[PDB]
Amino acid sequence: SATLFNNIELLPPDALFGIKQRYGQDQRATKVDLGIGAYRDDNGKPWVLPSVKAAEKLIHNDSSYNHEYLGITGLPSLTSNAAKIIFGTQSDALQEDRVISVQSLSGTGALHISAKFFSKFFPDKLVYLSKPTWANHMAIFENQGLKTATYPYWANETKSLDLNGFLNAIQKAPEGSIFVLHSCAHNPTGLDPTSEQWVQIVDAIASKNHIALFDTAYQGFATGDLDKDAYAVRLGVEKLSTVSPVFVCQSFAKNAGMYGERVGCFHLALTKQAQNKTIKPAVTSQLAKIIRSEVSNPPAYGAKIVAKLLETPELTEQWHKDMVTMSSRITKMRHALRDHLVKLGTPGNWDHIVNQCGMFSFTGLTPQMVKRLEETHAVYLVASGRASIAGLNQGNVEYVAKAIDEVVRFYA
Amino acid sequence: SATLFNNIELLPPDALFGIKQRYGQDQRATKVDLGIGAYRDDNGKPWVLPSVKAAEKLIHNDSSYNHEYLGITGLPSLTSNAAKIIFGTQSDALQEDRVISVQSLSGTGALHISAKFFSKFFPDKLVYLSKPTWANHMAIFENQGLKTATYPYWANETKSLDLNGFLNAIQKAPEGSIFVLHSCAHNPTGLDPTSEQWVQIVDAIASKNHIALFDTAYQGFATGDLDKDAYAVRLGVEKLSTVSPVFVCQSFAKNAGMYGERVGCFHLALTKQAQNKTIKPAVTSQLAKIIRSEVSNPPAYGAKIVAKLLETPELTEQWHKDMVTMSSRITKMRHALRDHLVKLGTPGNWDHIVNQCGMFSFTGLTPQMVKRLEETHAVYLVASGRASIAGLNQGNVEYVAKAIDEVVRFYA
Ligand SMILES: *Cc1c(COP(=O)(O)O)cnc(C)c1O
Ligand SMILES: *Cc1c(COP(=O)(O)O)cnc(C)c1O
Known part of the structure; x- marks a missing residue:
């Protein structure tokens, strides 16, 4: 030794x-x-966004301020409100109670829970990434033994998005394959499909029974509007509802400027099933286990900042302005x-x-x-x-x- | 699907x-x-510890205060000082530059890094836990495909340490086995081996070429004295310097009251050899990949508080008093x-x-x-x-x- x-x-x-x-x-x-x-x-x-400066001041003036453990699944205030900004207030998935939300270690943590979940139940599924995708995407999935494939995205010739190469890859892919999509503001290219192109992209995913995973790290930086930047995710949530489970890896590293505080949420829009009553707490329990076995519970301070930001109407308003300021x-x-x-x-x-x-x-x-x-x-x-x-x-x-x-x- | x-x-x-x-x-x-x-x-x-309150105040009173990404391996200020409280400033492992130290999501995160590192490089090694031991221990290792075993520890009849059965298990285990030891303040029993008993336990592990993993989640709570509580770890790093690499999972959750901020460190005392010039960097780059592909980088805020505590004399003298007040x-x-x-x-x-x-x-x-x-x-x-x-x-x-x-x- x-x-x-x-x-x-x-x-x-x-x-x-x-x-x-x-x-x-x-x-x-x-x-x-x-x-x-x-x-x-x-x-x-x-x-440091003005909206968070204000929120941090409220958090410290609270007489019940402590660094006590949060639940295994994180702060409910964060998860509940976070899912609202992604899925939408008039979301069928939310109203129907088909969304499993857990607090994760920013966007990477959410992507790791997905990879770990996949490696335990469906180890055979291929993980497709964009030709020129985020530099850490491959490692996250390969750290769990999953095999990754690639789909055309960037066409160097015309500096445009190869829509025909993308749609083809979704067809020539094994039924039930996992497609990792950048919800908006494609890290590295910064070239996203239009509203119209997203329809084709999602209809192709729906016809091959593929599983969509929306890596959401820049909601607010594409157009400066939160709802406009969640069009891709919401479009998939309505169409894959009777097709396959939707995975959403939300990060507050950029839009809320939380970076090193590691604040994010893992969402999962279950499919419409009659037995969803049992499925819901069943899967949730699997997730809680993964979190407990590796991290025990997520960081509190950063989660408390974003929750108050999402809860308080004047800080939510100021945050919107801080994002227009940045964008x-x-x-x-x-x-x-x-x-x-x-x-x-x-x-x-x-x-x-x-x-x-x-x-x-x-x-x-x-x-x-x-x-x-x-x-x-x-x-x-x-x-x-x-x-x-x-x-x-x-x-x-x-x-x-x-x-x-x-x-x-x-x-x- | x-x-x-x-x-x-x-x-x-x-x-x-x-x-x-x-x-x-x-x-x-x-x-x-x-x-x-x-x-x-x-x-x-x-x-919330009075010393923690004072450190947390200085951090917010800093003009350069922010929420930026820390490096993959964490705040160097935290890791260096944390290594010093457990190993001892006069440690041979430290003066010889033999200790690798990275920031982790508290003690659970550090234990997880250990499990994944072993799962990745030495899959067949068995992980021995005490009987009884912390309820979450098993799942951390089994989550990584590692087989666990147990060693006699608590004897309910005598309500004391079954040293001979503990020692028999060490001797009977296949050489190179991993033994998860509780540095002090054993969870759940509250029963620790006396200084004389630790000498025997360490000698037995040395004789069998076993790997020692000290789960240090209570340094400062057993005797209320930091040095007194780091006895087993210091003994281990001393006697095992020519036999096996010593793993140290350190948590500031209880002694510093950081609980939900997830502040901890994974330490690794390498064996004595001239190849360390390349071994240290190679193993360190391996640990960084595991962090990057799972959680990317560690929580910023909690690390800054504890870091400030450890590096500010009056604040650290107060921390020692706070621990006595608690214990x-x-x-x-x-x-x-x-x-x-x-x-x-x-x-x-x-x-x-x-x-x-x-x-x-x-x-x-x-x-x-x-x-x-x-x-x-x-x-x-x-x-x-x-x-x-x-x-x-x-x-x-x-x-x-x-x-x-x-x-x-x-x-x-
Ligand atoms: C920043 C980012 C993430 C995740 O970041 P975290 O800091 O770990 O939340 C994921 N995907 C892309 C494209 C990103 O830019
Ligand atoms: C607390 C504790 C840990 C780790 O706790 P974290 O809050 O995750 O740092 C590990 N082992 C034992 C025996 C503990 O009591």
């Missing part, structure tokens, strides 16, 4: 969290961080960056920067160009070309626009 | 968190809660109960309640006696006869003394 770990290999640093580390140790005064999609304000610093500054920078490149006369077309939505911009820069931006210009992007627009501000947009210009011309 | 969940079994509630529910759903005004081992003051209310009240309630049963002339001997340490007492009551306590007296205990002394106070010890006197005469 003295040489037990001698054969264990070194895994490389995380694709996204690694760029954060390199950025941190870089001593150059010119460094710019456009890696991890974290919201930064006009001065390039983290921004509007990101738009102003998409324009500022595109116009600077147009003024610099940078080769090629750059309108895709403003056309894409969300927090990012799939620039279309080659790995070579991305490497030079870091090593030569101290600008940090994801090796894929993805850049966090929130890292841009009036004080650095031109420096970044000139750096991009140089690297595009350098490899021309 | 509509009937996928029409065959999923229904699992029973948590043996511990279930008492909390049933107790909460009780209308009786004369009810006492001796279920979950969560500290309560003299008025029976949650008690002091528990010991006060143990004597009050024993003395009340003696005065009532309750059949049998009850010195075991005062002989035990930590916050529990394995009372010896039968499951039926326990069942009659809440079914007639509204006194909630764990089915195994375990009672958390913290739930007792000057306003109810007399009442629980009478309720117990009644059940002992009724059945026996």
